[PDB]
């Protein structure tokens with residue numbers, strides 16, 4: 001049994017976003033719209049329900065840990081359910097949670113060489129935190145093969161590179177390298193059950209679709225409904241392809257890509273505050289449900305039972 | 309009229325703290341104890357109720373902004389009630405909130421030279437954030453005299469140095485300099501009303517007590533009830549004087565110091581998860597109330613009306 005807990009399902013500045021009065025965010029604050037609050041994206045994995053591996057540490061990590069009881073097993077005066085942390089990139093959105101875990105160092109942190117480089121220079125989390133009882137102990141993620149974290153010995157991680165787009169603070173932001181962005185294949189080796197996790201997904205080649213058909217659950221990038229959704233909402237000009245996020249709709253969007261996967265469970269995660277699929281009455285939400293695609297929400301539990 | 313809004317009243321890792329099962333934190337989670345959740349310490353100041361100055365940007369800033377309606381005035385598609393940020397030190401606990409405000413740059417940030425130095429080297433917030441549309445625009449806090457932030461032209465800030473203890477990541481952590489830690493005197497120049505704000509207070513000389521008697525409201529360090537409260541709770545060994553926090557109780561504690569101030573409104577803020585004053589039934593809470601001292605809580609509004 002593989003447990004997947006959605007601690008956060010939003011992109012970005014969460015939902016609602018602190019400085020945003022778009023139709024979704026103002027509608028949620030006004031109470032005029034049927035949608036649920038969401039913290040920034042992060043999931044937790046386990047093979048036994050007691051030892052958990054965090055994927056990305058969002059700035060909302062304090063409220064996310066508190067909302068999920070297994071994160072506090074209460075086995076000592078100081079304790080946590082977090083046994084390791086995996087990072088998929090070095091973005092601020094996906095890493096600042098680590099600053100809120102220093103009362104509990106050391107932590108095993110798994111990340112590639114590129115991300116480790118960002119996190120010792122432009123955003124030197126590893127350097128800052130080594131001053132708290134050992135800080136973060138780096139475990140390198142190699143760009144080929146697999147790894148296993150002792151705390152969950154039945155989970156086999158197989159990362160796959162995505163389109164390198166290093167963060168704006170990165171010393172190598174103009175010089176993208178493989179290792180900047182990862183998606184994760186996760187296998188319960190007791191059952192063959194396979195999770196495909198890609199919350200940041202900019203494009204889909206055919207090596208990727210081959211991975212995805214060997215998987216039972218697809219937990220994928222859903223930040224934007226339209227590639228120019230920021231412009232459509234009046235909140236900015238950056239495009240989906242500029243951010244490395246493939247929109248749901250249109251030619252080559254994730255919904256059309258996902259029509260090739262009727263076997264798999266399909267879940268959209270990492271959803272931006274502008275996306276109409278957050279409006280539970282939107283026609284965009286209704287179409288997503290027609291296509292057999294779920295919309296992740298804070299608190300969602302996904303149990304991976306067996307292989308199809 | 310000076311408005312003081314308590315966005316967060318806790319020290320530390322908030323209350324409850326993510327990894328703590330002390331009597332307070334487990335008691336709150338178990339539902340066995342009468343206490344209210346608290347985010348990490350931060351207040352917001354205003355002279356008109358519309359333009360707000362943030363004092364310290366805690367890691368909980370997203371939930372704190374959302375909980376206080378004037379932080380979203382909804383005057384445009386992107387908007388915020390934050391018009392400036394003042395930092396009293398460079399600690400991670402009091403600054404990581406800035407990483408969650410990058411969708412809204414530029415921000416005017418006021419801080420001393422020492423803190424600016426920390427925030428461009430050991431924890432380079434200013435460098436990281438300058439990649440988001442101008443980032444943080446530094447306004448130096450001088451170690452003498454006063455300053456005024458245009459957005460609240462009737463608030464006069466007069467900082468006073470406290471015992472220099474630079475943070476553990478600081479390149480100068482073993483070499484403390486004046487400018488590392490500030491307390492704030494805040495004056496409504498229309499009325500003479502004066503707030504004395506010192507959430508981190510390690511000792512009390514007589515220059516300080518002279519400041520405090522010219523003030524109407526004392527909003528002061530309340531993190532620890534006893535100097536060795538960590539040891540008494542089983543959660544660690546660092547002492548109150550090691551952290552630069554003067555306990556409430558005992559010879560020279562803040563309660564004995566505050567007996568000399570019966571005129572002033574007195575509020576304890578920045579309270580650690582271990583402190584029994586969070587237990588609303590504790591005898592420590594009852595004594596605090598007897599002495600005419602209030603316990604700050606998330607959401608507390610303090611209106612400074614006039615000068616005594």
Ligand SMILES: N[C@H](CSc1cc(C[C@H](N)C(=O)O)cc(O)c1O)C(=O)O
Nearest residue numbers: 011012013091092093167168243272411
């Ligand atoms: N610091 C950058 C931020 S880019 C980014 C932007 C958005 C859109 C944003 N929420 C909005 O509505 O104004 C959503 C995201 O998920 C992002 O990641 C990085 O991530 O490198």
Ligand SMILES: N[C@H](CSc1cc(C[C@H](N)C(=O)O)cc(O)c1O)C(=O)O
Nearest residue numbers: 103319320321399400401475476551580
């Ligand atoms: N990163 C350091 C952290 S020291 C600090 C420690 C505590 C005690 C802590 N909460 C606990 O119960 O385990 C409370 C605080 O308010 C602190 O500031 C800094 O602040 O320089």
Ligand SMILES: [Cl-]
Nearest residue numbers: 091092093167
């Ligand atoms: Cl980033």
Ligand SMILES: [Cl-]
Nearest residue numbers: 399400401475
């Ligand atoms: Cl610190």
Ligand SMILES: [Zn+2]
Nearest residue numbers: 011012041093
């Ligand atoms: Zn994100």
Ligand SMILES: [Zn+2]
Nearest residue numbers: 020022025273
């Ligand atoms: Zn919005």
Ligand SMILES: [Zn+2]
Nearest residue numbers: 319320349401
């Ligand atoms: Zn603090």
Ligand SMILES: [Zn+2]
Nearest residue numbers: 328330333581
């Ligand atoms: Zn506690």
